[PDB]
Amino acid sequence: PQAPIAAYKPRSNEILWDGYGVPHIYGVDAPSAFYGYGWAQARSHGDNILRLYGEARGKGAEYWGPDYEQTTVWLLTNGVPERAQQWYAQQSPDFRANLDAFAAGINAYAQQNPDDISPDVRQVLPVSGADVVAHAHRLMNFLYVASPGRTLGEGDPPDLADQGANSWAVAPGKTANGNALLLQNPHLSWTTDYFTYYEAHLVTPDFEIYGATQIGLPVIRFAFNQRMGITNTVNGMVGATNYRLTLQDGGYLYDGQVRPFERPQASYRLRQADGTTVDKPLEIRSSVHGPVFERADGTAVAVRVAGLDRPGMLEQYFDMITADSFDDYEAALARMQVPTFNIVYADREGTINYSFNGVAPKRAEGDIAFWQGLVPGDSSRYLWTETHPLDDLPRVTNPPGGFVQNSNDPPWTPTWPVTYTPKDFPSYLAPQTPHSLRAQQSVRLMSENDDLTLERFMALQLSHRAVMADRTLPDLIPAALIDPDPEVQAAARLLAAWDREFTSDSRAALLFEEWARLFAGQNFAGQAGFATPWSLDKPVSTPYGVRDPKAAVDQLRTAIANTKRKYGAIDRPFGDASRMILNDVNVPGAAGYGNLGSFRVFTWSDPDENGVRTPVHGETWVAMIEFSTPVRAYGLMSYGNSRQPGTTHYSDQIERVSRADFRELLLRREQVEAAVQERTPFNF
Template sequence: MLVLLVGSQSNSSSPSSTEILWDTYGVPHIYGKDAKSAFQSFGWAQMQSHGNLILRLYGQARGQGAEYWGKEYLESDEWVQTMGIPERASKWYEAQNPAFRSYLDAFAAGINAYALKHPELIDDEVEMVLPVRPVDIIAHEQRVTNFTFIVNPESVKETSDRTNPVGSNGWAIAPARSASGNAMLLANPHLPWSDLFVWYEAQITAPGIDAYGATLVGLPVLAIAFNNNLGWTHTVNTHDGWDAYELQLKDGGYLFDGKVQAFETEKKILKVKQDDGTLRSIPLVVQRSIHGPVVEQKDGKALALRVVGLEQPGALEQWWDMARATKLSEFETALKRLQIPMFTVMYADRQGHIMHLFNGQVPIRSQGDFKYWEGIIPGDTSTTLWTKAHPYTDLPRVVDPPSGWLQNANDPPWTTTFPAALNPADFPPYMAPQFMSFRAQRSARMLDEDKKISFEEMIKYKHSTRMELADRLLDDLIPAARKHGDELARRAADVLEAWDASANADSRGAVLFSFWAEEMDFDSAFSTPWNQNSPRTTPDGLADPPRAAKALSTAAAKVEAAYKALDVPWGDVFRLRSNNVDLAANGGPGSLGIFRVLNFAPASDGRFSAFDGDSYVAAIEFSNPVKAMALTSYGNATQPGSPHVGEQLQMFARKQLRPVWRSRQDIVAHLEKREVF
């Protein structure tokens, strides 16, 4: 059991003890006497910062959310149970190597020890999830990676449109392009600001590790991190790790290679908490084909789901070993296990190496291109059934390109640098699609145009709100509005001409342009479509200038009616809101070609509130000592009463990062409290 010994702010500690030094931004700096103690303290720290959220997420990972909290969690439970997450988590737990399994045990012990010592700080509504078991951690990780990021209920419903709503930016800059001569790394995931997507920032120090970074709440290891020698970040890659197979039903089973195969059937009972506190039982029949679980059945056909990575239980240990690596060869030794089922890896190190890896478990498919496998796949033949994944050597990978820079903004690996270092023709056509979004084009433009990038410039570029879409189309839209538009469209054109093409808080014209973009159908809007031979300058031009002018008039009418002015500042309409904080936002949707991504939802007052986008940012230079600045946009806690809920939003609004304190001297100089175990 984890026991709190002292709570002073003293700097002295015995080597036999483990401690957490909490800095003034609520970041825990964990000093473990051994790895097991570090994991235990990390569990304790996460509970202190996010206890209610963690317990709710673990309850959902058990597939018991409706039993604990009511019918609104029933759909989640049906998904978790149909995908077999609880049973598979038990197998994965047993499959861990004994040492790492003991670390998972310790993380769970830290969670439970905190809850035992501070029951008054845990909401009554979630305390029934206690005690947490190590298998809950595995189930949560599986739900997050395999059954949220790779596939989720929404993506199954929209099989023909697999656009992943989550995203990220990542940069790796070699010494040749760095003003200081040191390699640099930019980590910048864009995720929703709630639920299982919340980032938690921490430092973990123990024999063999001294890593700083962030992880998704509830995970026991850092998923984006750096140490004194190297660092990496992840972006959501264009990885197709699941397929929906259409089965032909016959005689109670399904046809496969001309024979009727029986479904594997399992009957489960889901419990749903009623308003009066009683439990109602709902039967759930799970059918599985050779492809995977059945998710839909109608008109004599069924849809079965096949998902990668369900035989690879070692993602958490791989992340742990990536953070312990001291050079590229050690880092790649961990990567080669391919236990992490997806996510691009962007890497930089003190020796000056940079790397981009299209990481993931990519099925070896017998036929078809990327688009083919996005559709419904015939499930009546073994020719379409994949059973193996590509080895590490088959994956798109770039190390130390002549350009001196690498970027990924959720675009395919072919556009990671220019001149191009990868040829799609050298890979199977299903490996990744071909496109380059406006955000990726903006990303590459900023890197390519500055031949010597300083640390400060990298941070400045990170906060760029310039719209690549505006740069591409204003020269066509403004003349179109003046030639084909009505009086309102012409007034709108004047506003756009005076605009700075950015989405800063004081930018006048950004609201109007974004409303115009909402009115347009960009699938058919461009006169020159995207071309793989001109990936950074296409698409371009307006295919139908009169229609674009009419759309501008429509957008202008909406803006003027809602905000009384066509040139209303961006920050008057788009807001950053948390608790009692209400600030003018800067940044916007990546679809507009903005590098600083913020996504907004309509608010009751006619404005829009950010709920998603730039979440954790870390800028790292591998100098001696390492220089780093970071920000967790919404603060490093969600637990009610914590002073760290939403506290970094003011800096976020000012486009600022905060210094990362890694040395004991710096941490103690900014100490909030000290806990010794």
């Protein structure tokens, strides 16, 4: 109807909650919607939001003791609580009012429902707009871009490190009905608090947004509406540098001169087991690069984070997701206030766009591997001061191929055919590393399909191909059949009969994973085992083959043992071992590891004593949107919409997830009114 449906114009403030605890927040103006949003978030996730906001204040240690102390030291040394005050002071008046409203929403819920807030996090109250800013700043710059694990060279815990996503946007020309399609599909921890997605709907007379965001964030990162929608995937935009300092004469050597550290003398409180606290002094040293950390091995490392002068992250996302046109979206994107992420855009006018987004330092020399390692901190040659504008970054708009995609692969095949190559960009922007089997599968699923309907688009999202099996079994099986061990022969035949799909009933899939663990490493990303290595000239059909079939058969022998150790048998049905268990809901699993090729992702834990494992990471918020008039959208949230103790909205979608039975996402007032179970009238 090339003119959108009449926008709903709310006349009172109310949250209409549906049966799954999805809040439909109707506000008479923007602060009202943000207030209801905070209120809703607090109701569904209050305890963890408070804890996180506590942490963002640099008060984790003070509130909860030694387990929170590393983050405290990290955030204080990096001046995060103070930077938050600054960024908060630096908001536009309008947006600050929204942030304040959001916080007031949280406080108000807590004030009206004090017994619903967990006793341990009551002390955090009240919260403020600055806390909201701090949390978002922590999340973006000091979890995503820089983290203490990386700076300390200890590595990040899985809670943080397991990050991924799928993203598809399909142009009209590639669809049946002529409307852009969009897949929102982030893959984060199912347990990590700051990575908990919350689904919501905000309606004012001026804007409408539907979708998911991490708890405690006041704006929706995976948002769509009647006009447009976006989705994100992590791109590991190298937005920070760790510098190895040479310590000398009480300072650090730099361009042959001894330079002084800048020193604040801070201190923080540390909660004791008995509930009292001790004051711990904290000296914060900064070189010209940034704050200085000392590794366990005694290396002095200065961490330099890009975009510390970018306070408009939350407002950028807000203006992006409420954009009236693609030009507006881009103008907002072009502010470079969002420090990281691939961002994919689709709208009802038919535009699709992929952007390798973030705040990337301009560097005179060095490739991406150089800039991800310890960079020498004794030379001004390595001190960047400038960042790339949007226009310097890999982007694709309405490509000839009619789609854009990203599955955390380097941005070198975001569409097919490609519209640029690695040499078109500085070598430090993105790795030129092999694309994962899931990423190759993403390109294939879009490129190879035409005349897409929403239903078909949704079916394709469910892909759970063992691509790794396609690349290896042709060589492994014949070689395994040579082996005299009848068990190895039996294993080979089990593997040969398998359709190479990670279905619940697959008796071969677990064994295969175990072999793959050895063949391609614990993360299934190793390349040394393949006969034909990955090539950007065959980006979706390499790597391929088994380089050393003898050794691979030895790996199968060990794998057979591992499978039996873990699962009690080499032929246990995949979905008997792989379970999705939330509260007392226990449903069969399907799909699996992305690195094995599964597009739909469940990163199955190690099994327990019964051989049972559950997703530690993977499908969380999944939504497919057709930009028809009106839009049509379906979605699910694996672990429900609430994690508050005792909620009925934690385990209430996982059964549907197991059957790929998506909910209709309800954006229209009439639909919302039809689905409403709870109403929270409010007044901001």
